[PDB]
Design a protein around this ligand. Structure first.
Ligand SMILES: *[C@@H]1O[C@H](CO)[C@@H](O)[C@H](O)[C@H]1NC(C)=O
Lengths: 215, 194, 213
């Protein structure tokens, strides 16, 4: 039962520090090449650090002087100490075991999220996206100015799923997120059916039910 | 008297894999080093402690000449205070190294269309080599807690890998022949410059 | 060493052959290359190492080849679980690097988006900001252009947009764009329009409203 279980990710202010850990089973961390690979949201894989069985360590230029890779043989655990964190270090961080030409990077952790930001936790404002002012009508909810991710959206307490699109949030220049959730329905339904979006934001313990009507 | 046989190191037809680097013990002879420093064009001729130009003026008990082939990007590891797969697991110079490191591109000799697979290096080793240590083990590398029992498999890796030099490789991936001259001071001195 | 994958997106049907390219900036031994699969929300998964060695448990339809600067991942007969992102990797340096990824997506017939424009709500206007939202619903292929116009002036630098993942039922995409202005700037203009260009549209489609109607 070979696995890598990561821990330690979370929210941190710019200039702060975090330590990630990666507990291994089914192989010996100190006997292997081990790596940290990160993926910023929506982007590719960036290999940031590697440690050799004999102890040598190497870093991508993007993290040199700030990140330190290390391990504890007695706990069979890999670590990544991250200092002087910046917004652009926001990413899912993976640990992995490398075999290079003898077998590729074959074992991967499940990933842990690191979010670097100076924004403070804030629940969303929820505004109607209202249709009228053709066969299909569109309505929705604009879930604006919250931090941090994630928010959930449902419609009519889960009774409405067909035609729902909840979009990836966008990060605004304020450091707060904004998200839209929409649903298309038959236009003859606007006058007969009630539509309510249910927004939940765990981190601020905010829950809002917003009814959306034609204007 | 008898001239030190440097051609019999530098001009050898075949060179060793780095993991099994060869060492020639040079003794009772006279050696001109200024000729080497002018005998060919070497892409690297770095001396530590001694001077390439001002070298024929000294005396030593024995001179060691170590030679092997590595990849162009790895020549920088053949220096004191370095790390990497070669410095750590194949050929290690001491921090206090006095000697010279000579290298030249050997693409025309050691590369082959379709890959030359004769030159190997050690990929897996539990700990770093001591200086001037030579590890020629081919025991299966145990990367987990289960013994390998001579069989390759999961967590059980043959420790050597082939460079696979091809003539079309980028220069950093081309083969380089390396000679490391090491100067021993112990006993009557037996190698001297003129 | 920079690895460049092409194409950025491969659009195919199940049962078809996928050919994915990775080009290295520097000619390198085949032993230094590897290929990975990544599905949404999951860690990468190794497929091929040493350019051509299939990893343990990886289906036979996956094979890799190439040498020097040009490497290829082939999926001989695409299965539904193969639509994912693929990454090449080189480990000749320490640390190595990855390619930027190739997405393999479901191909389907062209489908024009339905387009909707939403005024800012009066509740939001109370707070001093106006968000105008434009929705492009269920289109294919993914390439679409949204042009915001305010009193027919083309707007640049004041909108953000976001796209869904390919729909599991009809294989389309949807796009949501938000134009953000201050309430004061919003009240200085009348006509707000969203002009959409897409392969499925004969000519651009503009939805609009006039502030205060
Ligand atoms: C190797 O042979 C060449 C060609 O004859 C000669 O010029 C060179 O000095 C030789 N190298 C050594 C170290 O003797």
């Amino acid at each position: 039962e070979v696995q890598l279980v990561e821990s330690g990710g979370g929210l941190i202010q710019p200039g702060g520090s975090l330590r990630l850990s990666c507990a291994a089973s089914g192989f010996t961390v100190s006997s292997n090449y081990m790596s940290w690979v990160r993926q910023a949201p929506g982007k590719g894989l960036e290999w940031v650090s590697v440690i050799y069985s004999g102890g040598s360590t190497y870093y991508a230029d993007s993290v040199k002087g700030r990140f330190t890779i290390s391990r504890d043989n007695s706990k069979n655990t890999l670590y990544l100490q991250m200092n002087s964190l910046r917004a652009e270090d926001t990413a899912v961080y993976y640990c992995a075991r490398d075999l290079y030409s003898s077998g590729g990077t074959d074992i991967w952790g499940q990933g842990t999220m690191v979010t670097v930001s100076s924004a403070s936790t804030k629940g969303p404002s929820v505004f109607p996206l209202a249709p009228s002012s053709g066969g299909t009508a569109a309505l929705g909810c604009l879930v604006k100015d919250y931090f941090p991710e994630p928010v959930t959206v449902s419609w009519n307490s889960g009774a409405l799923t067909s035609g729902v699109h909840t979009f990836p949030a966008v990060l605004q220049s304020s450091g707060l997120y904004s998200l839209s959730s929409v649903v298309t329905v038959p236009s003859s339904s606007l006058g007969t059916q009630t539509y309510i979006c249910n927004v939940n934001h765990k981190p601020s313990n905010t829950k809002v039910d917003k009814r959306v009507e034609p204007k | 008297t008898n001239l030190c046989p440097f051609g019999e190191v530098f001009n050898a037809t075949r060179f060793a894999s780095v993991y099994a680097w060869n060492r020639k013990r040079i003794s009772n002879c006279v050696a001109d080093y200024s000729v080497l420093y002018n005998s060919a064009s070497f892409s690297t001729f770095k001396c530590y402690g001694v001077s390439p130009t001002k070298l024929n003026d000294l005396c030593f008990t024995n001179v060691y000449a170590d030679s092997f082939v590595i990849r162009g990007d790895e020549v920088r590891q053949i220096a004191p205070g370095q790390t990497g797969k070669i410095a750590d697991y194949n050929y290690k110079l001491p921090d206090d190294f006095t000697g010279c490191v000579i290298a030249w591109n050997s693409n025309n000799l050691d590369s082959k269309v379709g890959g030359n697979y004769n030159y190997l290096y050690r990929l897996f080793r539990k700990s770093n080599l001591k200086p001037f240590e030579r590890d020629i083990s081919t025991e299966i590398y145990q990367a987990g807690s289960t013994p390998c029992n001579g069989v390759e498999g999961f967590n059980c890796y043959f420790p050597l890998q082939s460079y696979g030099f091809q003539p079309t490789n980028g220069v950093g991936y081309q083969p380089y022949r390396v000679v490391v001259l090491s100067f021993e001071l112990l006993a009557p001195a037996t190698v001297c410059g003129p | 060493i920079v690895l460049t994958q092409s194409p950025g997106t491969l659009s195919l049907s199940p049962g078809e052959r996928a050919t994915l390219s990775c080009r290295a900036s520097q000619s390198v031994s085949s032993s230094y290359l590897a290929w990975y699969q990544q599905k949404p929300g999951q860690a990468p998964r190794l497929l091929i190492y040493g350019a051509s060695s299939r990893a343990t448990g990886i289906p036979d339809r996956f094979s890799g080849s190439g040498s020097g600067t040009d490497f290829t991942l082939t999926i001989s007969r695409l299965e539904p679980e193969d639509f994912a992102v693929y990454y090449c990797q080189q480990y000749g340096s320490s640390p190595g690097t990855f390619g930027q990824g190739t997405k393999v997506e479901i191909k389907r017939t062209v489908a024009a988006p339905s387009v909707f424009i939403f005024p800012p709500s009066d509740e939001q206007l109370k707070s001093g900001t106006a968000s105008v939202v434009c929705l492009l619903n269920n289109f294919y292929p993914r390439e679409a252009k949204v042009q915001w116009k305010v009193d027919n002036a083309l707007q640049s630098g004041n909108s953000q947009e976001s796209v869904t993942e390919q729909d599991s039922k009809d294989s389309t995409y949807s796009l949501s764009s938000t134009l953000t202005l201050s309430k004061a700037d919003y009240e200085k203009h009348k006509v707000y329009a969203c002009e959409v260009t897409h392969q499925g549209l004969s000519s651009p489609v503009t939805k609009s409203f006039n502030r205060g109607e």
